Amino acid sequence: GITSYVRTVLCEGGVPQRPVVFVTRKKLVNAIQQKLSKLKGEPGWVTIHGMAGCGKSVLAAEAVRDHSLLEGCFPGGVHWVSVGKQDKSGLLMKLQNLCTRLDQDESFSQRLPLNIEEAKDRLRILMLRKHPRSLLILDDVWDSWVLKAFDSQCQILLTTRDKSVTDSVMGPKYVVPVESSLGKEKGLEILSLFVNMKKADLPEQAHSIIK
Amino acid sequence: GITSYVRTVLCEGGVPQRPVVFVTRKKLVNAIQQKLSKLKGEPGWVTIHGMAGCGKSVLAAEAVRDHSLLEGCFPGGVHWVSVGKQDKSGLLMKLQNLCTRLDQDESFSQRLPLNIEEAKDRLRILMLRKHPRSLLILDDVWDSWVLKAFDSQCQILLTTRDKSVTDSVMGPKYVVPVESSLGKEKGLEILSLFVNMKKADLPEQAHSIIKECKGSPLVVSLIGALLRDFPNRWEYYLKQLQNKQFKRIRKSSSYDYEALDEAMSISVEMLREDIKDYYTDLSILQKDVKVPTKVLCILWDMETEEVEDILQEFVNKSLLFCDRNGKSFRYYLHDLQVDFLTEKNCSQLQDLHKKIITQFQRYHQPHTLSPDQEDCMYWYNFLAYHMASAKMHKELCALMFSLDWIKAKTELVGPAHLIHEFVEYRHILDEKDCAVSENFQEFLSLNGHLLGRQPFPNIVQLGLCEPETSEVYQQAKLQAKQEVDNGMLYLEWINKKNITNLSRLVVRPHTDAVYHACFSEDGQRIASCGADKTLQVFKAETGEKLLEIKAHEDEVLCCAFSTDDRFIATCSVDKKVKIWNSMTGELVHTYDEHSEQVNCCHFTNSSHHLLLATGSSDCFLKLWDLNQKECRNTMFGHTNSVNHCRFSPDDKLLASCSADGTLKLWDATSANERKSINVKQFFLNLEDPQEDMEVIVKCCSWSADGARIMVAAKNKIFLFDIHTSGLLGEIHTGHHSTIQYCDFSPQNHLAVVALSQYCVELWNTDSRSKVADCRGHLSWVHGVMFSPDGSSFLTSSDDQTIRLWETKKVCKNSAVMLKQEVDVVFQENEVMVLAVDHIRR
Ligand SMILES: Nc1ncnc2c1ncn2[C@H]1C[C@H](O)[C@@H](COP(=O)(O)OP(=O)(O)OP(=O)(O)O)O1
Ligand SMILES: Nc1ncnc2c1ncn2[C@H]1C[C@H](O)[C@@H](COP(=O)(O)OP(=O)(O)OP(=O)(O)O)O1
Ligand SMILES: [Mg+2]
Ligand SMILES: [Mg+2]
Questions:
Q1: Measured between alpha carbons, how far is B115 from B94 in angstroms, rounded to an integer?
Q2: Starting from the edge strand earliest in sequence, which strands make up the sheet with B556-561, in order?
Q3: Assigned fold of B501-812
Q4: In angstroms, rounded to a whole number, what is the distance separating the alpha carbons of residues B750 and B807?
Q5: Is residue A60 within 8 Å of residue A117, measured between CB atoms?
Q6: Is the Cβ atom of B56 under 6 angstroms away from ligand 2?
Q7: What residues contact B406, with CB distance under 8 A and at least 6 apart?
Q8: Residues B157, B64: contact at Cβ < 8 Å?
Q9: How large is the angle between the packed helices A116-125 and A88-102, nearest 10 degrees?
Q10: Neighbour order of strands in the sheet with B664-667
Q11: Which of A156, B234, B236, B614 gives B622 a disulfide partner, CB atoms 3.0 to 4.6 angstroms apart?
């Protein structure tokens, strides 16, 4: 049960809304969230990983989707960044864009840094004062210097495919590892939603394809 | 009713004001609006789509045009963006421009983002705080990354042509799909506004052009504006659209294209090169055929699971409408879509027409065709069609000529489609063959009457009956010779040239006895009922089913077309005067008043007045006012049950007949009696105890001007002059008895009269002499009536048979057809048959 307020914080954050055809993974979401709860304060990084298409992002979106962990724990808003895969130049822009996003007031200089580190300063300072209890989520990430760039000393959680990526970084690191499996009961649940029929009404063919 | 405030919000939004010449589409607007209402909160996208120029934008503008949905629902203002079609650079500018538009305060940085995403941030943030309950509308949109850019998590509704576009996006999506149709009532509404006249005041020409329009409001506005300049050249554009070329129609307009052809060209380009070639093949398909997927598989030569998907991509491109009928899918086009194709693909089409056939040859042969296969009927119905375009006449001989192909085609198609094909066939091949086609059509004349039933009698045996030789007879003798050695005990016939005066055509509409039939006023088609009480409506020429009617309560008593053939009254024992539409076939008018079963029904001959005179067994006439549910005037007058009823050419008058025999020229305008000739003119001083004979007139024949009433009864035809209330003509019938049926012919003063026992003699009125005998109906006729041209006449009969006849044939003498009962004595090598002379011994 999403609170109306949760959506309001989430909209500001910019996390994608969950696909209309989804199926909770209560145990997994619960684990990330309880673990996610763990770094109550002081920096910290969380890595989530799986072979391609394991529900890795949706869980990240889903975990924060809940009110309890987020509201009591996280007075700071949540900011989502879609890192992707980047050459050094490309990475630079994302940083400026995060700069513009975070500084809604514009009190900070309209001029944007031409240097990565300076952006790192704007992030750290902004996280430190402007958004004291903020959590940053990342999407993908394929090389370490990238997290080197985002290494603001403020909690950022990166979700990915390589688990090697967060080795440059410093501070407590925890990993929740998503095996690509799912549940036969659940997929039937998912298939039903996809074709809109009582699960039993589903044809004999359906059972086998899920295998 | 626009609120003043609504306009104030709308102006800020920047949506265009609706064109001055518009016509609400209440149902559609209502649907979008109610649906549009649905995403009360939380992101959401709405897609609206149609083939080009379907009113897609105007609806978007119109939906929001209303106060109720917008004001309560949408505290945020509405912002409209005209996306168009864009390269990556072009798209970028629109974003900045939306940035500048939304931030009127300028509190946000004057500097503009050089990066799309940053603009996405400015939009999301601005939508989130600056305009909390805002709705964004988009125009067009041709590629997904575009909506990827606008995907702000805040409701945006995109209106377009492709429905594929909103697949990248996330969140609830609903689509309202606008078919390009419009309403005939509405377009007349639109046309009136375009030319500024009361709708009725609009010229006769106007109705027909709208049929061409096919509801693409773009065409209507396009024609309509075009007319504003030149009110005089009204027909011209009518024939122009009859031409089927849209290069002629052009107007500068708010809309973004000179012409309708102009819009389609824009749609075609986008398709990826591999797809693009395929569409053209799609060009060949009929304007109005839902083809089974398979045939598309055959032309393509590409496997079925694959073939469907490309078509699915088209349907999204809105260039080919879907048909989810069961597992089967029939795709088809708008008349406009088809026309564009020939306009833009015509040179290829003749060439391709030969491509499809060869592929079919690489698969099923026409004899190798089967009943179970889904595609085959298309193959019957239209394969014939492709070969014609192919222009290959020898191949056309390889197919259509084949008698067995005719057999299978007549097995599930019926014997009408082939006749229709043949008319097309005649131009395509050769004049000399045309004779062969003439011989085959002659072979068909014998086919219609009994051929369809079931026990498809071995035609090969019933075929050897034609005369002369031609190509149809030559085929038969050889086939017979082939059959004969094997067996089959075929019996040769040696007298054909000595026997049978063939009728031009025969129809069995019903297994159940016919009760009435009538020509279309246009003469293009005929409707017959029957004992079953179903009525079947048909076009006589090609002789192919053109109408099926499910039932009429009670047994049909008689039926008739409206003067403009727009209606069909149906009399019945129930007393349900069911005036079904003659086109849609759906019921329109209905009436009842008679104390007894109706004797006759007829629409007013006048184009103006709409009345329904109806005789019945209760003797009372009922002069219905067709414009009113209840009768204009009950008319007691006949002392006996009405025999027949017809409107007089003077609609003010209304003649009627009955068993008393006296004519009754009623004054319908006064709803009162005016004239009524007595009929004792059949004087006959017999030894019969009854005094002067009580004449019983049947048919209520009219003069070609209708100024006088021809009639017939007992032993004499009469020609009364109702305007002077006195006798004039008097055509005595053959010998003496009592007439069972009669029919005056306005041409040649002819009188086709069935006296008794199907004695359907051809007499000549006024001259008072017979022209020629007409043997050939079984069951003693049940009825006959001439074509409106008068060049032909139907012959309904008790057998359940309707024989068409040329006017010319009847006049010529034909002393043949031996007498029914004869004794024949056989003395060896020659057999002699006893006969009764056509005249005497
Ligand atoms: N309830 C659900 N949970 C997880 N995935 C779902 C659910 N319902 C549907 N899906 C499908 C649809 C989405 O395309 C996909 C979710 O994407 P996601 O798990 O974020 O992949 P990913 O982002 O880890 O891939 P990549 O490693 O390429 O980034 O799973
Ligand atoms: N009441 C009406 N409703 C719809 N269209 C109308 C009406 N009155 C006139 N028209 C004509 C004039 C306009 O040129 C046209 C409306 O344009 P519209 O339906 O927005 O096309 P469109 O924007 O969907 O085309 P495209 O697909 O090229 O964008 O229809
Ligand atoms: Mg991801
Ligand atoms: Mg438009």
A1: 12
A2: B556-561, B567-572, B577-581, B587-591
A3: Methylamine Dehydrogenase; Chain H (2.130.10)
A4: 10
A5: no
A6: yes
A7: B418
A8: no
A9: 30
A10: B642-645, B653-658, B664-667, B672-675
A11: B614
B contact residues 122-141, partner A, Cβ 8 Å cutoff: 124-125, 128
Q: Do B171 and A20 touch (CB under 8 A)?
A: yes
Tell me if B52 CB under 6 Å of ligand 2. yes
Give the domain B272-345 fold: Arc Repressor Mutant, subunit A (1.10.10)
Task: Tell me if B172 sits within 8 A of B39, measured CB to CB.
Answer: yes
Beta-carbon separation of A97 and B108 below 8 A: no
Contact between B299 and B285 (Cβ < 8 Å): no
Q: Which fold has domain B346-487?
A: 1.25.40
Neighbours of B332 (CB within 10 A): 17
A vs B: CB pairs below 8 A: 35
Ligand 2 contact, B152 CB (< 6 A): no
The answer to whether A130 and A74 are in contact (CB under 8 A) is no
Q: Side by side, which strands form the sheet with B156-160?
A: B78-84, B135-140, B156-160, B45-49, B173-177
**Is any ligand 2 atom within 6 A of the Cβ of residue B44?**
no
CB contact under 8 A, A20 and B113: no
Q: Which two tokens stand for residue B288?
A: 């109005």
Q: Do A101 and B113 touch (CB under 8 A)?
A: no
CA angle B288, B294, B296 (to 5 degrees): 65
Q: What single-letter amino acid sits at B81?
A: V
Would you say A72 is a known binding-site residue? no
- Give B755-769 as a 3 state SS string: CCCCCEEEEECCCCE
Distance of alpha carbon B415 from alpha carbon B23, whole angstroms: 46
Task: Tell whether A20 lies on the interface with B, counting CB pairs under 8 A.
Answer: yes
Mutation pick for ligand 1 pocket among A27, A32, A57 (CB with most ligand atoms within 8 Å): A57
The CATH code belonging to domain A1-180 is 3.40.50.300
**Token output for B736:** 């003496």
End-to-end CA distance of chain A: 32
By the 8 A CB rule, do B271 and B279 touch? yes
Q: What is the dihedral of CA A183, A187, A193, A198, to 10 degrees?
A: -90
Is any Cβ of chain B less than 8 angstroms from the Cβ of A101? yes
Which CATH number applies to B181-271: 1.20.1090.10, 2.40.160.210, 3.30.420.40, 1.10.8.430? 1.10.8.430
Copy the structure tokens of residue B484.
């004969």
Tokens of B516: 């009435």
SS (H, E, C) B8-21: HHHHHHCCCCCCCC
Please state, in angstroms and rounded to a whole number, the distance separating the CA atoms of residues A26 and B335. 55
Tokens of B284: 């060949």
Question: Closest approach of chain A CAs to the CA of B173, in angstroms?
Answer: 10
Q: Is B308 exposed, middle or buried (0-12, 13-18, 19+ CB in 10 A)?
A: middle
What resolution in Å is listed for this PDB structure? 3.8
- The reply to whether residue A16 touches residue B121, judged by beta carbons under 8 angstroms, is no
* Neighbouring C-beta atoms of residue A55, cutoff 10 Å: 18
- Strand order of the sheet with strand B726-729? B700-702, B709-713, B716-721, B726-729
Ligand 2, atom 20: closest residue by C-alpha: B57
- Whole-angstrom CA distances from B490 to B445, B472, B498, B830 are 22, 18, 21, 20
Binding residues of B: 50-57, 161
Angle of helix B204-213 versus helix B217-229 axis, rounded to 10: 140
Helices (H) and strands (E) in chain B, counts: 25, 36
CA–CA distance, B462 with B471 (Å, rounded to integer): 16
Give how far B366 is from chain A: nearest CA, Å: 37
